[PDB]
Amino acid sequence: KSNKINDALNQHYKLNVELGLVYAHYAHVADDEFDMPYLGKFIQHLSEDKLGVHKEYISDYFKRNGMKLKTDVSVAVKSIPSDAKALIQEVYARENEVRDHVKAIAKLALAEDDYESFYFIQWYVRDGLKDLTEVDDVVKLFNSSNDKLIIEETIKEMV
Amino acid sequence: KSNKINDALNQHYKLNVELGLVYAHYAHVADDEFDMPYLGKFIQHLSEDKLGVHKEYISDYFKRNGMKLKTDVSVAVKSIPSDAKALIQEVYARENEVRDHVKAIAKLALAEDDYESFYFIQWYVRDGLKDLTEVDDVVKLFNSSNDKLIIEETIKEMV
Amino acid sequence: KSNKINDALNQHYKLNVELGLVYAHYAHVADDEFDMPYLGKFIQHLSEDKLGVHKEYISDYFKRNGMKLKTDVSVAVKSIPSDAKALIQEVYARENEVRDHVKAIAKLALAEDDYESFYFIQWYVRDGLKDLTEVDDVVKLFNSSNDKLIIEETIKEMV
Amino acid sequence: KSNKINDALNQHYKLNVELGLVYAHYAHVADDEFDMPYLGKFIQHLSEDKLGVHKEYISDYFKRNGMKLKTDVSVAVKSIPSDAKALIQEVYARENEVRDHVKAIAKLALAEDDYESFYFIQWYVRDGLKDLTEVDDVVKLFNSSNDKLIIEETIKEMV
Amino acid sequence: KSNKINDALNQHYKLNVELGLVYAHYAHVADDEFDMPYLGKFIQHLSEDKLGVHKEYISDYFKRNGMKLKTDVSVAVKSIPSDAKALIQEVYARENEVRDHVKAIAKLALAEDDYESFYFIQWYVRDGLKDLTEVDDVVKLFNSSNDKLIIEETIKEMV
Amino acid sequence: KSNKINDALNQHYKLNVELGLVYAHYAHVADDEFDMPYLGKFIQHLSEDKLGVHKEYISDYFKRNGMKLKTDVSVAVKSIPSDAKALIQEVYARENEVRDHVKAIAKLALAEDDYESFYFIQWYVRDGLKDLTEVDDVVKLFNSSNDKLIIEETIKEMV
Amino acid sequence: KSNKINDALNQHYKLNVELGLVYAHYAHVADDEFDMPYLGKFIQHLSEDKLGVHKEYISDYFKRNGMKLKTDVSVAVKSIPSDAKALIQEVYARENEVRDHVKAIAKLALAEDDYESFYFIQWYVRDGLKDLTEVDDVVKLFNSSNDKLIIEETIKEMV
Ligand SMILES: [Cl-]
Ligand SMILES: [Cl-]
Ligand SMILES: [Cl-]
Ligand SMILES: [Cl-]
Ligand SMILES: [Cl-]
Ligand SMILES: [Cl-]
Ligand SMILES: [Cl-]
Ligand SMILES: [Cl-]
Ligand SMILES: [Cl-]
Ligand SMILES: [Cl-]
Ligand SMILES: [Cl-]
Ligand SMILES: [Cl-]
Ligand SMILES: [Cl-]
Ligand SMILES: [Cl-]
Ligand SMILES: [Fe+3]
Ligand SMILES: [Fe+3]
Ligand SMILES: [Fe+3]
Ligand SMILES: [Fe+3]
Ligand SMILES: [Fe+3]
Ligand SMILES: [Fe+3]
Ligand SMILES: [Fe+3]
Ligand SMILES: [Fe+3]
Ligand SMILES: [Fe+3]
Ligand SMILES: [Fe+3]
Ligand SMILES: [Fe+3]
Ligand SMILES: [Fe+3]
Ligand SMILES: [Fe+3]
Ligand SMILES: [Fe+3]
Ligand SMILES: [Fe+3]
Ligand SMILES: [Fe+3]
Ligand SMILES: [Fe+3]
Ligand SMILES: [Fe+3]
Ligand SMILES: [Fe+3]
Ligand SMILES: [Fe+3]
Ligand SMILES: [Fe+3]
Ligand SMILES: [Fe+3]
Ligand SMILES: [Fe+3]
Ligand SMILES: [Fe+3]
Ligand SMILES: [Fe+3]
Ligand SMILES: [Fe+3]
Ligand SMILES: [Fe+3]
Ligand SMILES: [Fe+3]
Ligand SMILES: [Fe+3]
Ligand SMILES: [Fe+3]
Ligand SMILES: [Fe+3]
Ligand SMILES: [Fe+3]
Ligand SMILES: [Fe+3]
Ligand SMILES: [Fe+3]
Ligand SMILES: [Fe+3]
Ligand SMILES: [Fe+3]
Ligand SMILES: [Fe+3]
Ligand SMILES: [Fe+3]
Ligand SMILES: [Fe+3]
Ligand SMILES: [Fe+3]
Ligand SMILES: [Fe+3]
Ligand SMILES: [Fe+3]
Ligand SMILES: [Fe+3]
Ligand SMILES: [Fe+3]
Ligand SMILES: [Fe+3]
Ligand SMILES: [Fe+3]
Ligand SMILES: [Fe+3]
Ligand SMILES: [Fe+3]
Ligand SMILES: [Fe+3]
Ligand SMILES: [Fe+3]
Ligand SMILES: [Fe+3]
Ligand SMILES: [Fe+3]
Ligand SMILES: [Fe+3]
Ligand SMILES: [Fe+3]
Ligand SMILES: [Fe+3]
Ligand SMILES: [Fe+3]
Ligand SMILES: [Fe+3]
Ligand SMILES: [Fe+3]
Ligand SMILES: [Fe+3]
Ligand SMILES: [Fe+3]
Ligand SMILES: [Fe+3]
Ligand SMILES: [Fe+3]
Ligand SMILES: [Mg+2]
Ligand SMILES: [Mg+2]
Ligand SMILES: [Mg+2]
Ligand SMILES: [Mg+2]
Ligand SMILES: [Mg+2]
Ligand SMILES: [Mg+2]
Ligand SMILES: [Mg+2]
């Protein structure tokens, strides 16, 4: 097993956990402070996504190839974006950074001739683009209407 | 809303998140290092429990009564118990401490005449005893047999 | 049986009856004067709630523990809020006062060592918070959009 | 719209509310003090009848023809009939007075050439006679047997 | 675990066992000596209630919190009430005393900050009032009719 | 009716009640102290057997033939066997004594030419042998394996 | 088509055939000599896997891209591992070597810009890790218990 891939995947595990905890806070704020419970449910589903399969796939993959899991988590939510559009724009920015880290891991697996890892990362390559697409669709709405309740209703059909 | 109850519930939110992240690591170790995948699935279900409804009930309760959510999370898993029995014994110890914190919150709600909070905490009072009972049943097995595969098979029927 | 609990529960019976009659008027006004029939149906359901189980639970509880029922009802609706948002804001204020009276009854039952009464009041402790949450969700909409028909459509899915 | 019909219908709304609150008390007393829970359920159904459709039909009719609703309610139950037969005899007397008020409203609608109102009142003309028939059937039983449990059993099949 | 709560719950276990054995005798006598087999089945169901879940909940609760079970039972039925009404009146008296013991245990749990115990006792707080209500409904019948077969038939529908 | 049969059956009623209360304690101890919850459920089913039909058949038989029921119960569980095998061995000993008392009642019924009683006792003659067979099958396991969890699993299929 | 990829895939075809024939022998020995028929069925399923789709996918892929199939097979099973744990440990070693050959083919396809081949090999990259995981799970059991029949029973649920 590759130590650099092991480290890179342990950092991605850490990123998904910390992002998931931030999104859970953002989801609470979207509902409570911004009166957009469907925006909150959208962000909450992203939170459970990062804290669910996004982190468990890595821990399960480690079991198979003899890599070691590291749990080292530090996250504090110290400021909140000022309104709902800024809130989901901040979610978009974090999701775009996820794509960059995933790209680095794919590049490294090919450099290490670690084709089991390149394969494993394929899911994340795809899911990074679709999570970002789902978020971008929501960011769209805030530039498409000035009525929070119209946006809310549109979110309800986007699940 | 009570500031002391708000602080006490924010600390319990923090405890459930951090416990959930530790259990996820313990579940990985139970399977990978100790060859007890059903012990791992038992601990993993506890992890999803703490990181799921145990934390979301608090955030949802805050939305209703005007309390504020705090996300301040710090956890590192720096040593692992040496074998499976010590692993689940350590889970038992953490679950027993949960009962003590839950008791303090119930006592405080009555002191504050905060009966909505005393009510909310009732679930946790009960779930604290049953989570501890489920864990204690697993600790039982390691003193009841010296065969890991017998214990494993018994865990598989305890879900 | 406690005379003070009996008096406190008889006043709560009186409050639920009088609130129910006011809400029935408010529901009529929401539909007829303000053109918001779904706001009216929301308020009408609150009216039937107070005039239904909220009052009958008390009368039934009295049958069990030997307390006496008092019927002494006086209510006149002499002014109406000027628009729909003020109408539902006034409903919110009344529902928040209900929480305070419920809290006093819980405190008194513990003071009297009347644990059957503390138990009975638990439903009301919970229902006070959820009725207030349902009303607060509707008050949200009037600060989320300036289009009565958008608010109306959003109410129709909130039942 | 007719002001006299509006006033006459507002008084009938007031009568149905106040009668409904009295019957709810009578139903409680029939069960608790007189040991006739089925007599109580009979009277309770009359209570929900007056406090339900009997009052809501008027408020809904007002929405259609531009009449105004008045909520002005004053009722105290200060004495209770001494036994069950007197209790249901008192219910009969109140129901018979309802017929007289309904008759006055029908007479007035014809005098005003208000045929929408004469039509609306037709339901009440009929329901006044059948409510009084249902009550009279129960009053029958107390002159037909001296055994409360026989009367109770007969009430249970009369719904 | 609290020693005083342990003792108080062990005495309640003892009370439910001894009451259950007395009711089983009373049920036999209601059928055989008093010709009221449905009164007997009513009392027999109370007997199985006390000797069933009323005692097993305590023993199961002890397993969870580390309290010890005591079995110390002494009961002799040395006199029987003279007729059926006195028989069920005596059942009522015993059930009313159960409420008082349950109240003492709830008061003690709050005094000990034993919120798991206060929670456990909630069932008994409620069941004490409803068992007493069921018995009181049967005592009602003996003051409502002088015909044992009418009372019997009424009991058959009260289960 | 025979006075000696009446006395012999009243003593058997007393034996089944007292045995049932002891088994309920033994079942609690098998689960809590010995970590054998399925052994506990086996013993608990024996407890409900003695406290159920084993005692009610006698009380019902008395109703038919004019014998009198006596309730005189005295039982204290003052020592517990030291381990699970001794626990079920003690259950076996008590069940074997039941066979001897049942035999004495059958012998007495034939001596009294009480053929209704000899018939009634036939069930007990049979059930005495099968209850003892069920218990003996469990005692078998403790001499067949030294692993409590293997024994536990075998008990789970023996119901 | 690449001659080096053609040669590398023809060697992998040869490896899967020869491994499949060895596993078929090992499966026979696991059942017959070692009394572990479920271990035998596990190894037999691996045998049919290598001799089935693992070899036919290659021959079918050759049909599509114009590569030539070579059949050149030489295998003799001349010694058998001494016990069951050594038997499955030897299976593990062979499966781990399969991963190395699969890795070389993936590396070569990228070197040849043969992306149809890199794609085809992806299945094998994944199946190499899961076949090795399935085998490793069985090797686990021999270090988890010293009872062949416990291991056998555990294998039966692992299919
Ligand atoms: Cl941070
Ligand atoms: Cl690889
Ligand atoms: Cl830490
Ligand atoms: Cl409160
Ligand atoms: Cl007023
Ligand atoms: Cl109480
Ligand atoms: Cl009045
Ligand atoms: Cl007209
Ligand atoms: Cl006694
Ligand atoms: Cl507690
Ligand atoms: Cl004794
Ligand atoms: Cl005979
Ligand atoms: Cl060879
Ligand atoms: Cl290509
Ligand atoms: Fe919400
Ligand atoms: Fe996903
Ligand atoms: Fe950070
Ligand atoms: Fe903005
Ligand atoms: Fe995702
Ligand atoms: Fe996704
Ligand atoms: Fe829509
Ligand atoms: Fe729409
Ligand atoms: Fe739609
Ligand atoms: Fe596994
Ligand atoms: Fe749970
Ligand atoms: Fe920490
Ligand atoms: Fe250890
Ligand atoms: Fe839980
Ligand atoms: Fe739980
Ligand atoms: Fe087994
Ligand atoms: Fe099994
Ligand atoms: Fe099984
Ligand atoms: Fe309308
Ligand atoms: Fe409700
Ligand atoms: Fe008022
Ligand atoms: Fe306004
Ligand atoms: Fe409500
Ligand atoms: Fe409600
Ligand atoms: Fe719309
Ligand atoms: Fe819609
Ligand atoms: Fe819709
Ligand atoms: Fe009743
Ligand atoms: Fe009607
Ligand atoms: Fe009046
Ligand atoms: Fe009279
Ligand atoms: Fe009517
Ligand atoms: Fe009617
Ligand atoms: Fe009938
Ligand atoms: Fe009948
Ligand atoms: Fe009938
Ligand atoms: Fe009978
Ligand atoms: Fe019950
Ligand atoms: Fe006694
Ligand atoms: Fe008497
Ligand atoms: Fe009960
Ligand atoms: Fe009950
Ligand atoms: Fe009859
Ligand atoms: Fe009947
Ligand atoms: Fe009937
Ligand atoms: Fe258990
Ligand atoms: Fe049986
Ligand atoms: Fe004894
Ligand atoms: Fe022993
Ligand atoms: Fe039996
Ligand atoms: Fe049996
Ligand atoms: Fe089995
Ligand atoms: Fe098994
Ligand atoms: Fe089985
Ligand atoms: Fe075979
Ligand atoms: Fe396969
Ligand atoms: Fe070879
Ligand atoms: Fe070996
Ligand atoms: Fe394969
Ligand atoms: Fe495979
Ligand atoms: Fe099995
Ligand atoms: Fe099985
Ligand atoms: Mg390279
Ligand atoms: Mg206080
Ligand atoms: Mg006090
Ligand atoms: Mg005219
Ligand atoms: Mg205190
Ligand atoms: Mg003879
Ligand atoms: Mg190249």
Short mmCIF file of C-alpha atoms in Angstrom, two decimals, chain F:
data_model
loop_
_atom_site.label_atom_id
_atom_site.label_comp_id
_atom_site.label_asym_id
_atom_site.label_seq_id
_atom_site.Cartn_x
_atom_site.Cartn_y
_atom_site.Cartn_z
CA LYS F 1 -66.71 -33.49 47.55
CA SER F 2 -63.72 -34.99 49.36
CA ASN F 3 -62.14 -32.91 52.12
CA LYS F 4 -58.81 -34.72 51.76
CA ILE F 5 -58.74 -34.16 47.99
CA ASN F 6 -59.74 -30.54 48.62
CA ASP F 7 -56.82 -30.15 51.03
CA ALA F 8 -54.40 -31.97 48.72
CA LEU F 9 -55.41 -29.79 45.77
CA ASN F 10 -55.19 -26.62 47.87
CA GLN F 11 -51.62 -27.56 48.81
CA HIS F 12 -50.79 -28.15 45.14
CA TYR F 13 -52.24 -24.73 44.31
CA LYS F 14 -49.98 -23.28 47.02
CA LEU F 15 -46.97 -25.19 45.67
CA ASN F 16 -47.47 -23.95 42.10
CA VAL F 17 -47.81 -20.33 43.25
CA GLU F 18 -44.71 -20.48 45.43
CA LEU F 19 -42.68 -22.37 42.81
CA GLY F 20 -43.76 -19.81 40.22
CA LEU F 21 -42.51 -16.93 42.36
CA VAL F 22 -39.18 -18.69 42.94
CA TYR F 23 -38.71 -19.40 39.22
CA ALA F 24 -39.41 -15.75 38.39
CA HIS F 25 -36.51 -14.84 40.69
CA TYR F 26 -34.31 -17.59 39.23
CA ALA F 27 -35.09 -16.34 35.71
CA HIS F 28 -34.04 -12.81 36.69
CA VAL F 29 -30.79 -14.16 38.16
CA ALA F 30 -30.02 -16.36 35.14
CA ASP F 31 -30.13 -13.28 32.91
CA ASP F 32 -28.64 -10.64 35.20
CA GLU F 33 -25.98 -12.45 37.23
CA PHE F 34 -25.15 -15.38 34.93
CA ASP F 35 -25.38 -13.72 31.47
CA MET F 36 -27.74 -16.41 30.12
CA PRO F 37 -30.86 -14.53 28.96
CA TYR F 38 -32.21 -17.55 27.08
CA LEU F 39 -31.84 -19.71 30.18
CA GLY F 40 -33.75 -16.91 31.90
CA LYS F 41 -36.52 -16.96 29.31
CA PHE F 42 -36.76 -20.75 29.68
CA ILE F 43 -37.14 -20.46 33.46
CA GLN F 44 -39.50 -17.49 33.07
CA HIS F 45 -41.80 -19.58 30.88
CA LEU F 46 -41.88 -22.22 33.63
CA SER F 47 -42.75 -19.47 36.10
CA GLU F 48 -45.71 -18.25 34.04
CA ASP F 49 -46.73 -21.90 33.61
CA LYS F 50 -46.98 -22.54 37.36
CA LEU F 51 -48.54 -19.13 38.08
CA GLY F 52 -50.89 -19.53 35.11
CA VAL F 53 -52.77 -22.66 34.08
CA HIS F 54 -51.21 -24.86 36.78
CA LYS F 55 -53.01 -22.82 39.45
CA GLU F 56 -56.10 -21.71 37.51
CA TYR F 57 -57.13 -25.25 36.53
CA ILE F 58 -57.41 -26.04 40.24
CA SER F 59 -59.45 -22.93 41.05
CA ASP F 60 -61.72 -23.62 38.07
CA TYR F 61 -62.11 -27.28 39.03
CA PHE F 62 -63.12 -26.16 42.53
CA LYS F 63 -65.92 -24.03 41.05
CA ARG F 64 -67.42 -27.13 39.42
CA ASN F 65 -67.44 -29.65 42.29
CA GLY F 66 -68.09 -27.39 45.28
CA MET F 67 -64.61 -27.44 46.78
CA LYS F 68 -63.25 -24.34 48.49
CA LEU F 69 -60.16 -22.40 47.45
CA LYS F 70 -57.54 -21.44 50.02
CA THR F 71 -54.97 -18.70 49.43
CA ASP F 72 -52.13 -19.03 51.95
CA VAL F 73 -48.79 -18.12 50.40
CA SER F 74 -45.38 -17.76 52.04
CA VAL F 75 -42.16 -17.73 50.04
CA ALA F 76 -38.79 -16.02 50.44
CA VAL F 77 -35.81 -16.52 48.13
CA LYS F 78 -32.96 -16.27 50.63
CA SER F 79 -30.07 -17.95 48.79
CA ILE F 80 -29.34 -18.37 45.09
CA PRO F 81 -27.39 -21.27 43.52
CA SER F 82 -23.81 -20.29 42.77
CA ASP F 83 -23.82 -20.77 38.98
CA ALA F 84 -26.13 -21.51 36.07
CA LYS F 85 -25.79 -25.30 36.14
CA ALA F 86 -26.62 -25.39 39.85
CA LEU F 87 -29.51 -23.01 39.14
CA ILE F 88 -31.16 -25.32 36.61
CA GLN F 89 -30.26 -28.39 38.70
CA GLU F 90 -32.23 -26.82 41.55
CA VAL F 91 -35.16 -26.23 39.18
CA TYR F 92 -34.95 -29.92 38.24
CA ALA F 93 -35.10 -30.98 41.89
CA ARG F 94 -38.24 -28.91 42.53
CA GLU F 95 -39.91 -30.27 39.39
CA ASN F 96 -39.15 -33.84 40.48
CA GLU F 97 -40.85 -33.19 43.82
CA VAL F 98 -43.91 -31.96 41.91
CA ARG F 99 -44.20 -35.43 40.36
CA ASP F 100 -44.29 -36.98 43.84
CA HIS F 101 -47.09 -34.70 45.07
CA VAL F 102 -49.09 -35.31 41.88
CA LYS F 103 -48.68 -39.06 42.41
CA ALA F 104 -50.05 -38.77 45.95
CA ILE F 105 -53.14 -36.93 44.70
CA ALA F 106 -53.85 -39.57 42.05
CA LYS F 107 -53.46 -42.34 44.64
CA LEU F 108 -55.82 -40.51 46.99
CA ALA F 109 -58.51 -39.94 44.35
CA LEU F 110 -58.64 -43.67 43.61
CA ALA F 111 -58.78 -44.36 47.35
CA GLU F 112 -61.76 -41.97 47.65
CA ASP F 113 -63.54 -43.31 44.54
CA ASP F 114 -63.30 -39.72 43.27
CA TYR F 115 -63.02 -40.40 39.57
CA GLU F 116 -63.66 -36.82 38.52
CA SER F 117 -60.50 -35.95 40.49
CA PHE F 118 -58.45 -38.81 39.12
CA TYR F 119 -59.42 -37.54 35.72
CA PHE F 120 -58.54 -33.95 36.49
CA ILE F 121 -55.15 -35.02 37.78
CA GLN F 122 -54.29 -36.83 34.60
CA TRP F 123 -53.16 -33.58 32.96
CA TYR F 124 -50.85 -32.89 35.82
CA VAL F 125 -49.49 -36.46 35.68
CA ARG F 126 -48.53 -35.90 32.12
CA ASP F 127 -47.39 -32.29 32.46
CA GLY F 128 -45.23 -33.24 35.43
CA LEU F 129 -43.26 -35.64 33.25
CA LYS F 130 -42.88 -33.23 30.32
CA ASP F 131 -41.95 -30.17 32.38
CA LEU F 132 -39.33 -32.39 34.02
CA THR F 133 -38.21 -33.58 30.57
CA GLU F 134 -37.87 -30.00 29.30
CA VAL F 135 -35.81 -29.04 32.36
CA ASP F 136 -33.70 -32.19 32.10
CA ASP F 137 -32.88 -31.35 28.48
CA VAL F 138 -31.45 -28.02 29.66
CA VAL F 139 -29.46 -29.65 32.48
CA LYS F 140 -28.02 -31.90 29.76
CA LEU F 141 -26.31 -28.98 28.03
CA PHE F 142 -24.16 -27.99 31.01
CA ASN F 143 -22.59 -31.46 30.95
CA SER F 144 -22.29 -31.36 27.14
CA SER F 145 -20.27 -28.14 26.74
CA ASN F 146 -18.18 -25.75 28.82
CA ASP F 147 -19.07 -22.68 26.71
CA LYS F 148 -21.99 -20.67 28.08
CA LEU F 149 -22.63 -19.10 24.68
CA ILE F 150 -22.89 -22.51 23.01
CA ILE F 151 -25.37 -23.60 25.68
CA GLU F 152 -27.23 -20.30 25.25
CA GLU F 153 -27.52 -20.82 21.49
CA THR F 154 -28.76 -24.37 22.03
CA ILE F 155 -31.38 -23.10 24.50
CA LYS F 156 -32.62 -20.56 21.94
CA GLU F 157 -33.79 -23.43 19.67
CA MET F 158 -35.29 -25.39 22.53
CA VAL F 159 -37.46 -22.36 23.15
#
